């Protein structure tokens, strides 16, 4: 049966997805907050740009 | 420098002139979208329009007839034994295994040794006995018209005629468009696609076509869909038609309905065999409506059958901005598409909704 | 103080047209809707030459509106009749304002009225051309359109507002103009007074 | 047999779910509840671009953040100039149906897909100052949905036959092929370092492939409906997915778990396209109720609305330097914000 052959391939790939290392969410989420605080200066969308500096005005 | 600015302004002026020239032609064209179920006759109409409203329209096209001939005779012989009741005919027994041997091969038997004895099977009563009942298995709808005209074109290319070219069946690779020339603004008719998909996500793009042409078969009320034992081939069209009408994207689009394969339907009812009441239970109590205008070429019995099919489709439309139009067509006869064609044009969006000023 | 109430009433008319103030057919109607202060006159004419300008402007506006409605009706009817389709403003005013300031007018007491510094005396031909010619085309174009619906209620309901309003507003004025006796001089002003209400309809 | 195989498959799903529960320590909101919100954000239309006849279905910004290419429904690619609104080219197309466009990092080629299954590529700078077809790729089935450039000689496509392939312009053949989806693929977005990419299918799932080896790595399925758009966080360790229902979710590669849900009780429309900002602080998202919204990455509140397009936003993009935001729509109008 093709389905039996198809199901055999599907299960084999799933076994590889079970043995993946994972880390704590607390350390994961804290990295996102750290990144956004580092690059707060280089983002003209948040802090409005001066008229002379902005090429569009 | 200012020279760069002047050059850019000149380029912008040229591009703007080109855009202004090209805008006029787009605002006038009428676009039509074909639809229907698998193996219904959508692509036949598009080829028909080219051979009617366009003067223009070879060796490669000759080859597929031979390819079609190899498939039509293979299926009949293969289902001889696989059929649940025995229907076997001793002539051409030494060729039966030859058919099975060549039933699966990329290269066909180009030698004339295949054509001489395959004709015997057509003349054999055993193959003709199986051809009488074709509801159980799946057979190409143009098998008979090609088996009879065997070796007329096998000797040489012989530039096969258009009538023998239209009936050839070729799978749709992708989209299949056509822009024929008319005294009015030229139209843009395009085929739906190649493979059937249930989700139909691309339909959101089509939100500005003037009219949608729906094509449904009528000679298939006792055959299952390509996926075996699913449903009657007519019922699979009814479900698709209802889904199309009750669609969020298509809320202000009209529909034109074609009922092809009229000739095939005519021959089925005349020669008894399977009846409408056996497959459709509500046909027995039906009475022919008084508001009927049968054409003077049909006996009263068959005319009772045509309007039942139309009644089933039209009942779905009247339940739920939207209008529906019925028609009867037979695509192969070159004249018939023109008669509807020179007619279809006259009313739609033609004095009908044409009068968009509040009445 | 009745006129002051009417003075504010006609003042409210400008707001409706200003609020409106886009397709090929909508381009024509822009001038039609866009196209009276001296009505009171204390029962005016500060300048002798100033009085003629008001009458000329009124006549030009009336004929321009008639021509514009005629043009739009003809265009709509022709578009509906034939599937797959493929300068009046200047002309009307040119032949109308010129005789007003060109000393093209018409009794012994009448000359005395001109001598004293708002009498109106006269241009029926401008009249018959201004109203009779347009109405004859307007009935014919509409007559074909109603049949097209009959081939395939609300139609008559909208056509009534389309036609009868203008007909009742203008045809009695045309009948009054042709009367020129048996018509009171002050009575004639009332028929023309309601003419400006048509501008308030649109 | 079939029963044994099915039993084994279910025996692995529960382990994944149980392992995922142990990974969670605290919600994102709990950690990120001690910062000041950015506040109300208001911004107006600096420029408007006109000249398209039909709806725009996709657009892409150049690498210099000065030139953008847009694709319409009448088959016309025009390379605008953002500063002075001077259209530079107008390329006709063989197929009037178009769904994608792209701009090479070198700025020399522009790729346009479509429903004709052909991912043709054009040439911008050449002799005689013309634009001509360089190559046509026809080894693929189904309609296309996205196209992207890794370099001058590699292009990635994803179609509606549940496949994603990596082509090669010079040879004109598929180098590799990725399979595993059970529904129509709709969008993709390469990594900032161009080593991995993801894809959102129509079966409420998302994956993460590898360009070199060519095998699936993870699979996230927190949604409940179709998926329409994906974009990467600038860091490259997170990606936000916009689904057919109002919910917009932000997953994480390392934690392998959904973090936050962006939704509102007053919205029942869909999502068309999403994109981050330079510092990954905002999550701009299009909508099907004729306007655009502006969320927050952490606070999950709708700070502001950009509006007035008058038709559904159907494409969106942000410049490399973060100095502009551009949106398209179905009413043949493009606009630039600041
Ligand atoms: N005798 C006869 N054959 C017909 C008629 N209409 C269609 N056919 C045949 O039915 C087949 C239709 O093939 P196509 O034109 O590709 O239409 P289709 O089978 O629906 O294929 P798709 O349009 O791709 O779905 C061909 O074999 C036609 O010759 C008809 O009125 N009479
Ligand atoms: C006082 N207002 C006048 C009255 C008579 C008149 C007008 C316009 C066109 C004509 O053909 C007329 O006979 C009006 O402007």
Instruction: Provide the 10 A C-beta neighbour count for residue D294.
Output: 21
Token duo for residue D138: 């026809």
Under DSSP, is residue D235 helix (H, G, I), strand (E, B) or coil? coil
User: How far is the C-alpha of B133 from the C-alpha of B141, rounded, in Å?
Assistant: 13
Q: Which residues of D touch A56 (CB under 8 A)?
A: 46-47, 83, 323-324, 336, 338
Q: Chain D: nearest CA to A37, how far in angstroms?
A: 9
DSSP letter string, B94-127? HHHHHHHHHTS-SS---STHHHHHHHHHHHSHHH
Token duo for residue C11: 């003042």
CA B164 to chain centre: 16
Compute the CA torsion angle C132, C137, C140, C143 (nearest 10 deg). -90
- Exposure of D128 by Cβ count < 10 A (0-12 exposed, 13-18 middle, 19+ buried)? exposed
Token duo for residue C105: 């007018």
User: Do the beta carbons of residue B73 and residue B99 sit within 8 Å?
Assistant: yes
User: How far is the C-alpha of B166 from the C-alpha of D195, rounded, in Å?
Assistant: 51
The DSSP call for residue D127 is: G
User: How far is the C-alpha of D115 from the C-alpha of D143, rounded, in Å?
Assistant: 5
| Nearest CA-CA partner of B46 in B163, B171, B179, B161 | B179
Backbone region of residue D296 per phi and psi (left: phi > 0; alpha: psi in -120 to 50; beta: other values): beta
Contacts of D126 (CB under 8 A, 6+ apart): D132
| H or E, element range at D146 | strand D144-151
User: Do the beta carbons of residue D60 and residue D318 sit within 8 Å?
Assistant: no
Number of domains in chain B: 1
* Subunits with 3+ C-beta pairs closer than 8 A to C: B
| Nearest CA-CA partner of B292 in B260, B317, B326, B266 | B326
Residue nearest ligand 2's atom 13 by CA: C127
Distances (CA, A) of B218 to B99, B259, B310: 33, 6, 10
Q: Hey, which residues does B211 pair with through a beta bridge? A: B32, B254
- D320: nearest CA partner in chain A: A43
User: How far is the C-alpha of C199 from the C-alpha of D8, rounded, in Å?
Assistant: 84
Mutant choice from D80, D97, D139, D272 vs B, greatest count of B C-beta within 10 A:
D97
User: How far is the C-alpha of D155 from the C-alpha of D166, rounded, in Å?
Assistant: 6
User: Do the beta carbons of residue B40 and residue B215 sit within 8 Å?
Assistant: yes
Judged by CB atoms closer than 8 Å, whether chains meet at B19 and D90 is answered as yes
The Cβ-side half-sphere exposure at B99, using a 13 Å CA radius, reads: 25
Q: Which domain holds residue A36?
A: 4-56
Chain B residues touching chain D at CB-CB below 8 Å: 8-9, 11-12, 15-16, 18-19, 23, 26, 174-175, 197, 199, 201-202, 205, 208
The DSSP call for residue B160 is: -
Q: Which residues of B342-359 are buried (b: 16+ CB within 10 A; e: fewer)?
A: eebbeebeebbebbeeee
Q: Which residues have any ligand 2 atom within 6 Å of their CB?
A: C 55, 58-59, 62-63, 120, 123, 126-127, 130, 177, 192
Q: Which residues of D touch A29 (CB under 8 A)?
A: 26, 28, 31-32, 252, 255, 259
Question: What would the 3-class secondary structure string for chain A be?
Answer: CHHHHHHHHHHHHHHHHHCCCCCCHHHHHHHHHHHHHHCCCCCCCCCCCCCCCCCCC
Q: Hey, which residues does D286 pair with through a beta bridge? A: D292
Question: What is the third-level CATH fold of D181-333?
Answer: Methylamine Dehydrogenase; Chain H (2.130.10)
Q: Hey, which residues does D49 pair with through a beta bridge? A: D334
Chain B segment 185-204 residues within 8 A of C by beta carbon are 185
| H or E, element range at D25 | none
Under DSSP, is residue B327 helix (H, G, I), strand (E, B) or coil? coil
Question: What is the third-level CATH fold of C2-201?
Answer: Rhopdopsin 7-helix transmembrane proteins (1.20.1070)
Check if B169 is active-site.
yes
Under DSSP, is residue B200 helix (H, G, I), strand (E, B) or coil? coil
Q: Which residue among B169, B196, B338, B345 is the active-site one?
A: B169
Under DSSP, is residue B310 helix (H, G, I), strand (E, B) or coil? helix
CA D171 to chain centre: 27
Distances (CA, A) of B68 to A43, B124, B141, B203: 66, 20, 11, 33
The pairing of strands D120-123 and D109-112 is antiparallel
Check if B44 is active-site.
yes
Q: Which residues of C1-10 are buried (b: 16+ CB within 10 A; e: fewer)?
A: eeeeeeeeeb
| H or E, element range at D335 | strand D334-337
**A-to-D residue pairs, Cβ atoms closer than 8 angstroms:** 131
Q: Which residues of C76-107 are buried (b: 16+ CB within 10 A; e: fewer)?
A: bbeebeebeeeeebeebbeebbeebeeeeeee
Task: Please tell me whether B166 is known to bind a ligand.
Answer: yes
Which backbone phi and psi does B240 adopt, to 5 degrees?
Answer: -65, -40
Task: Please tell me whether B42 is known to bind a ligand.
Answer: yes
CA B57 to chain centre: 19
The Cβ-side half-sphere exposure at C63, using a 13 Å CA radius, reads: 24
User: How far is the C-alpha of D263 from the C-alpha of D280, rounded, in Å?
Assistant: 19
Task: Please tell me whether B133 is known to bind a ligand.
Answer: no
User: How far is the C-alpha of D158 from the C-alpha of D145, rounded, in Å?
Assistant: 6
Token duo for residue B160: 């096969």
Q: Hey, which residues does D133 pair with through a beta bridge? A: D122
Token duo for residue D312: 């559904």
User: How far is the C-alpha of B89 from the C-alpha of B127, rounded, in Å?
Assistant: 8
Picking from D2, D9, D297, the nearest residue to A14 by CB comes out as D9
Picking from A15, A30, A45, the nearest residue to D322 by CB comes out as A45
Compute and round to an integer the Cα radius of gyration of chain B.
Answer: 25
Of the ligands numbered here, which is closest to the C-alpha atom of C67? 2
Contacts of D88 (CB under 8 A, 6+ apart): B8, B11, B15, D67, D78, D79, D80, D81
Backbone region of residue D236 per phi and psi (left: phi > 0; alpha: psi in -120 to 50; beta: other values): left
| Nearest CA-CA partner of B302 in B267, B261, B258 | B267
Confirm or reject contact between B354 and chain C (CB < 8 A). Answer: yes
The pairing of strands D258-262 and D248-252 is antiparallel
Which backbone phi and psi does D220 adopt, to 5 degrees?
Answer: -110, 135
Rounded to 5°, the CA angle B134-B138-B141 comes to: 75
Q: Hey, which residues does D79 pair with through a beta bridge? A: D69
Check if B251 is active-site.
no
Chain D segment 40-59 residues within 8 A of A by beta carbon are 41, 43, 46-47
| Nearest CA-CA partner of B355 in C134, C139, C78, C30 | C78
User: How far is the C-alpha of C44 from the C-alpha of C41, rounded, in Å?
Assistant: 5
Residue nearest ligand 1's atom 10 by CA: B41
| Direct distance between the N- and C-terminal alpha carbons of chain D, in angstroms, rounded to an integer | 62
Task: Please tell me whether B193 is known to bind a ligand.
Answer: yes
Mutant choice from C23, C24, C84 vs B, greatest count of B C-beta within 10 A:
C84
Under DSSP, is residue D58 helix (H, G, I), strand (E, B) or coil? strand
Distances (CA, A) of D201 to A44, D6, D119, D184, D210: 34, 24, 20, 5, 17
User: How far is the C-alpha of D204 from the C-alpha of D219, rounded, in Å?
Assistant: 11
Token duo for residue B159: 């530039």
| Direct distance between the N- and C-terminal alpha carbons of chain C, in angstroms, rounded to an integer | 27
Backbone region of residue D279 per phi and psi (left: phi > 0; alpha: psi in -120 to 50; beta: other values): alpha
Distances (CA, A) of B56 to B37, B173, B191: 29, 22, 19
Token duo for residue A40: 């707060």
| Nearest CA-CA partner of D117 in D92, D134, D100 | D100
Number of domains in chain A: 1
Cite the DSSP H helix spans in B225-331.
Answer: 233-245, 262-270, 276-279, 300-319
Experimental method: cryo-EM
Of the ligands numbered here, which is closest to the C-alpha atom of B146? 1
User: How far is the C-alpha of D330 from the C-alpha of D312, rounded, in Å?
Assistant: 6
User: Do the beta carbons of residue D287 and residue D267 sit within 8 Å?
Assistant: yes
The DSSP call for residue B186 is: P
Helix-strand-coil percent breakdown of chain B, rounded to 5? 45, 10, 45
Contacts of B149 (CB under 8 A, 6+ apart): B164
| Direct distance between the N- and C-terminal alpha carbons of chain A, in angstroms, rounded to an integer | 68
Distances (CA, A) of A43 to D240, D277, D306: 20, 8, 19
| Nearest CA-CA partner of B207 in D52, D227, D331 | D331
Q: Hey, which residues does D238 pair with through a beta bridge? A: D252
Rounded to 5°, the CA angle C162-C168-C170 comes to: 100
How many residues make up chain D in this entry? 338
| H or E, element range at B130 | helix B125-132
The Cβ-side half-sphere exposure at C106, using a 13 Å CA radius, reads: 7
Contacts of D311 (CB under 8 A, 6+ apart): D55, D290, D329, D330, D331, D333
Sheet with D91-92: strands ordered across:
D56-61, D67-72, D76-81, D91-92
Residue nearest ligand 2's atom 14 by CA: C59
Q: Hey, which residues does B188 pair with through a beta bridge? A: B31
User: How far is the C-alpha of D325 from the C-alpha of D82, rounded, in Å?
Assistant: 11
User: How far is the C-alpha of D222 from the C-alpha of D230, rounded, in Å?
Assistant: 14
How many residues make up chain B in this entry? 359
Is there a common fold for D54-179 and D181-333?
yes
User: How far is the C-alpha of D235 from the C-alpha of D192, rounded, in Å?
Assistant: 8
User: How far is the C-alpha of D127 from the C-alpha of A27, rounded, in Å?
Assistant: 55
Structure-token match 């279905």, residue found: D57
| Nearest CA-CA partner of B260 in B53, B32, B34, B45 | B45
The DSSP call for residue B348 is: B
User: Do the beta carbons of residue D199 and residue D185 sit within 8 Å?
Assistant: yes
Confirm or reject contact between B357 and chain C (CB < 8 A). Answer: yes
Which backbone phi and psi does C164 adopt, to 5 degrees?
Answer: -65, -30
Check if B233 is active-site.
no
B and C interact (at least 3 Cβ pairs within 8 A): yes
| H or E, element range at D65 | none
Residue nearest ligand 1's atom 8 by CA: B41
Question: What would the 3-class secondary structure string for chain C be?
Answer: CHHHHHHHHHHHHHHHHHHHCCCHHHHHHHHHHHCCHHHCCCCCCCCHHHHHHHHHHHHHHHHHHHHHHHHHHHHHHHHHHCCCCCCHHHHHHHHHHHHHHCCCCCCHHHHHHHHCCCCCCCCHHHHHHHHHHHHHHHHHHHHHHHHHHHHCCHHHHHHHHHHHHHHHHHHHHHHHHHHCCCCCHHHHHHHHHCCHHHHHHC
| H or E, element range at D176 | strand D176-179
The DSSP call for residue B332 is: T
User: Do the beta carbons of residue C45 and residue C58 sit within 8 Å?
Assistant: no
**B-to-C residue pairs, Cβ atoms closer than 8 angstroms:** 26
User: How far is the C-alpha of B175 from the C-alpha of B43, rounded, in Å?
Assistant: 10
Ligand 2 center from residue C58 Cα (angstroms): 7
Contacts of B37 (CB under 8 A, 6+ apart): B196, B216, B217, B233, B236, B237, B240
| Direct distance between the N- and C-terminal alpha carbons of chain B, in angstroms, rounded to an integer | 61
Instruction: Provide the 10 A C-beta neighbour count for residue A13.
Output: 12
Select D54-179's CATH number: 1.10.3720.10, 3.40.50.1780, 2.130.10.10, 3.40.50.10420. 2.130.10.10
User: How far is the C-alpha of B97 from the C-alpha of B94, rounded, in Å?
Assistant: 6
| Nearest CA-CA partner of C166 in C90, C73, C27 | C73
A16: domain CATH number is 4.10.260.10
Quick one: CA dihedral C154, C156, C162, C168, positive or negative?
Answer: negative
Token duo for residue A12: 């084999």
User: How far is the C-alpha of C40 from the C-alpha of D80, rounded, in Å?
Assistant: 60
- A8: nearest CA partner in chain D: D5
What are the structural domain ranges in chain D?
Answer: 54-179, 181-333
Q: Chain C: nearest CA to B213, how far in angstroms?
A: 20
Compute and round to an integer the Cα radius of gyration of chain A.
Answer: 24
Confirm or reject contact between C76 and chain B (CB < 8 A). Answer: yes
Distances (CA, A) of D187 to C148, D10, D192: 51, 29, 16
B223: domain CATH number is 3.40.50.300
User: Do the beta carbons of residue D168 and residue D177 sit within 8 Å?
Assistant: no
Under DSSP, is residue B66 helix (H, G, I), strand (E, B) or coil? helix
Distances (CA, A) of B116 to B93, B113, B139, B150, B158: 14, 6, 23, 9, 19
Q: Chain C: nearest CA to B182, how far in angstroms?
A: 12
User: Do the beta carbons of residue D93 and residue D75 sit within 8 Å?
Assistant: yes
| H or E, element range at D87 | none
What are the structural domain ranges in chain C?
Answer: 2-201
| Nearest CA-CA partner of B263 in B215, B217, B311, B304 | B217
Angle between helix B93-102 and helix B59-82 axes, rounded to 10 deg: 120
| Extended strands (E) in chain B | 30-36, 177-178, 187-190, 211-216, 254-259, 324-325
Token duo for residue A51: 């008229």
User: How far is the C-alpha of D110 from the C-alpha of D121, rounded, in Å?
Assistant: 6
Task: Please tell me whether B161 is known to bind a ligand.
Answer: no
User: Do the beta carbons of residue D314 and residue D330 sit within 8 Å?
Assistant: yes
User: How far is the C-alpha of D54 from the C-alpha of D68, rounded, in Å?
Assistant: 18
Helices then strands, each counted (H, E), chain D: 2, 27
Chain D residues touching chain B at CB-CB below 8 Å: 51, 53-54, 73-74, 78, 81, 84, 86-90, 95, 97, 115-117, 143, 160, 183-184, 202
Chain A residues touching chain D at CB-CB below 8 Å: 1, 3-4, 7-8, 10-11, 13-15, 17-18, 20, 22-26, 28-33, 35-36, 39-40, 42-46, 49, 54-57
């Amino acid at each position: 049966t093709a389905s039996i052959a198809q199901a055999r391939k599907l299960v084999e790939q799933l076994k590889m997805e079970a043995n993946i290392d994972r880390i704590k969410v607390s350390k994961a989420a804290a990295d996102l907050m750290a990144y956004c605080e580092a690059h707060a200066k280089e983002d003209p969308l948040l802090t409005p740009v001066p008229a002379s500096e902005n090429p569009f005005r | 420098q200012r020279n760069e600015e002047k050059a850019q302004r000149e380029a912008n002026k040229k591009i703007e002139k080109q855009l202004q020239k090209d805008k006029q032609v787009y605002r006038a064209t009428h676009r039509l979208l074909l639809l229907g179920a698998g193996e219904s006759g959508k692509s036949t109409i598009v080829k028909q329009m080219r051979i009617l409203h366009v003067n223009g329209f070879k060796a490669t096209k000759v080859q597929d007839i031979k390819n079609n001939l190899k498939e039509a005779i293979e299926t009949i012989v293969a289902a001889m034994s696989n059929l649940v009741p025995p229907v076997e005919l001793p002539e051409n027994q030494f060729r039966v295994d030859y058919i099975l041997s060549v039933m699966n091969v990329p290269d066909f038997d180009f030698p004339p040794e295949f054509y001489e004895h395959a004709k015997a099977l057509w003349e054999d009563e055993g193959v003709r006995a199986c051809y009488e009942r074709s509801n159980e298995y799946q057979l190409i709808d143009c098998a008979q018209y090609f088996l009879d005209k065997i070796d007329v074109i096998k000797q040489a290319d012989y530039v096969p005629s258009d009538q023998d070219l239209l009936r050839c069946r070729v799978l749709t690779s992708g989209i299949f468009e056509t822009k024929f020339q008319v005294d009015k603004v030229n139209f843009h008719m395009f085929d739906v696609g190649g493979q059937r998909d249930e989700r139909r996500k691309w339909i959101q793009c089509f939100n500005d076509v003037t009219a949608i042409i729906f094509v449904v078969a009528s000679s298939s009320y006792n055959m299952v869909i390509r996926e075996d034992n699913q449903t009657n081939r007519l019922q699979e069209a009814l479900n698709l038609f209802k889904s199309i009408w009750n669609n969020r994207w298509l809320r202000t689009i009209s529909v034109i309905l074609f009922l092809n394969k009229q000739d095939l339907l005519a021959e089925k009812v005349l020669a008894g065999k399977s009846k409408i009441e056996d497959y459709f239970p509500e046909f027995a109590r039906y009475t022919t409506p008084e508001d009927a205008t049968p054409e003077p070429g049909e006996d009263p019995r068959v005319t009772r059958a045509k309007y039942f099919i139309r009644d089933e489709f039209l009942r779905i439309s009247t339940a739920s901005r939207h209008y529906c139009y019925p028609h009867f067509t037979c695509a192969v006869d070159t004249e018939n598409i023109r008669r509807v064609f020179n007619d279809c044009r006259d009313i739609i969006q033609r004095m009908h909704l044409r009068q968009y000023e509040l009445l | 103080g009745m006129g002051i109430v009417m003075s504010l009433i006609v003042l409210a008319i400008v707001f409706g047209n200003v609020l409106v103030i886009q397709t090929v057919t909508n381009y024509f109607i822009t001038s039609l809707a866009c196209a009276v202060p001296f009505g009171a006159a204390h029962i005016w004419t500060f300048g002798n030459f100033w009085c003629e300008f008001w009458t000329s402007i009124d006549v030009l506006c009336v004929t321009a509106s008639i021509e514009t409605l005629c043009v739009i009706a003809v265009d709509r009817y022709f578009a509906i009749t034939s599937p797959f389709k493929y300068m009046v403003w200047i002309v009307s005013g040119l032949t109308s304002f010129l005789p007003i300031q060109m000393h093209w007018y018409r009794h012994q007491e009448a000359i005395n009225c001109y001598a004293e510094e708002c009498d109106f005396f006269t241009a029926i031909a401008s009249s018959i051309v201004s109203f009779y010619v347009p109405l004859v085309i307007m009935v014919f174009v509409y007559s074909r359109v109603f049949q097209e619906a009959k081939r395939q209620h609300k139609a008559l309901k909208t056509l009534g507002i389309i036609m009868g309003t203008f007909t009742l507003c203008w045809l009695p004025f045309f009948i009054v103009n042709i009367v020129h006796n048996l018509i009171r001089k002050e009575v004639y002003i009332l028929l023309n007074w309601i003419g400006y209400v048509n501008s308030g309809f649109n | 047999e079939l029963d044994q195989l099915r039993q084994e498959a279910e025996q692995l799903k529960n382990q994944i779910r149980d392992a995922r529960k142990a990974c969670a320590d605290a919600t994102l909101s709990q950690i990120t509840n001690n910062i000041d919100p950015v506040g109300r954000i208001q911004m107006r239309t600096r420029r408007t671009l006109r000249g398209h006849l039909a709806k725009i279905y996709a657009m892409h910004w150049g690498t210099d953040s000065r030139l953008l290419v847009s694709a319409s429904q009448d088959g016309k690619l025009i390379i605008w100039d953002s500063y002075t609104t001077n259209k530079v080219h107008a390329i006709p197309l063989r197929s009037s149906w178009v769904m994608t466009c792209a701009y090479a990092p070198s700025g020399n080629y522009v790729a346009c897909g479509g429903l004709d299954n052909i991912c043709s590529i054009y040439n911008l700078k050449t002799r005689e100052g013309n634009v001509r077809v360089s190559r046509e790729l026809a080894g693929h089935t189904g309609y296309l949905s996205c196209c992207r450039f890794l370099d001058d000689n590699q292009i990635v496509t994803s179609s509606g036959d549940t496949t994603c392939a990596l082509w090669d312009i010079e040879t004109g053949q598929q180098t590799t092929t990725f399979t595993g989806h059970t529904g129509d693929v709709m969008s993709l977005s390469l990594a900032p370092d161009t080593r991995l990419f993801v894809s959102g299918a129509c079966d409420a799932s998302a994956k993460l492939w590898d360009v070199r080896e060519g095998m699936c790595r993870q699979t996230f399925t927190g949604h409940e409906s179709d998926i329409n758009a994906i974009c990467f966080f600038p860091n490259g360790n997170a990606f936000a997915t916009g689904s057919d229902d109002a919910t917009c979710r932000l997953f994480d590669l390392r934690a392998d778990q959904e973090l936050m849900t962006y939704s509102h009780d007053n919205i029942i429309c869909g999502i068309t396209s999403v994109s981050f900002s330079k510092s990954g602080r905002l999550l701009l998202a299009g909508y099907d109720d004729f306007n655009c919204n502006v969320w927050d990455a952490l606070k999950a509140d709708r700070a502001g609305v950009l509006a007035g397009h008058d038709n559904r936003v159907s494409c969106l993009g942000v410049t490399d330097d973060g100095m502009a935001v551009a949106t398209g729509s179905w009413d043949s109008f493009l606009k630039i914000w600041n």
